[PDB]
Amino acid sequence: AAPESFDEVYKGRRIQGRPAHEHGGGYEVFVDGVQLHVMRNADGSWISVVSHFDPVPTPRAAARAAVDELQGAPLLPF
């Protein structure tokens, strides 16, 4: 059972999530319309390719942590 979808503006950037050389994930996240690879761990926590070693509770938390990491930088498509 996947998390709910979301859509908000966080630190000036649009982050979105929705249920759906890299993985199979039942959930998709976007930062300014560019897909961010994210992954769910067995305990329900989430990580992303820009914060891979620091699990956060939800995909929205992963998107926000990616925005914080990016410091305004465009994401490159994976």
Added chain:
Amino acid sequence: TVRKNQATLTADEKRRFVAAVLELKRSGRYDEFVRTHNEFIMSDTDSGERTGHRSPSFLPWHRRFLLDFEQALQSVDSSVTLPYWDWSADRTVRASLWAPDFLGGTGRSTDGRVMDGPFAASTGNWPINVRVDSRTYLRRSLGGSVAELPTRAEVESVLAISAYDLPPYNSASEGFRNHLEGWRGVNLHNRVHVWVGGQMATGVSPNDPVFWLHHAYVDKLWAEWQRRHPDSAYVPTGGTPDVVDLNETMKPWNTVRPADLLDHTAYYTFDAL
């Protein structure tokens, strides 16, 4: 064939290590190591195939990946070996690791850009090409996203765990491998990635040369665990879906098994074990 504590390297050893790393970058070989690691970071999953991490083969896979890299360094300068970073001992930004004659220091506040050392973007010698965002400069925030590196007491607590790994052989496992990797417990290896910050905290973490020294110390800790637990060995030992069993071969090499990598002394020894 001796891996030394970074803190003990001579000036010539530091110089030759940095030069060899930079030649691998120049020739395009370095970035292919980044890309290999990223492929496995992004594809290994707790409920599906998992080889390079979040799984028992985390340790032999990284041992073989580090041997591939060391062999590449030696193809440039045969005297060079991978040093290791004991982050339980060398735990502040004041450590010589982070001096301008070795890896350079932390990144500036504005954009996390590393401004000194051989790998600073301003040198022209360290483009970040394999990347997940537009920025093409090495970044770090030492101690930014987590206060403290693991302590020696914390490490000792993980070395005390007798079982190598346990079902379900993933990030939810109890046992030594997952506590060393850090998904459960006081957290050793994952927390060091978070403490360095910058590209080390991302899915393209070998972009920072400290990656290799971190993993060389994680690999030493596996060797120290083996000595504490002579009656414990790699598991699982056959017939496990999605997980590399002891005698199964591992991607990407396909020609080596965890069994071929349990004894490091077939390839190198440490200055002190």
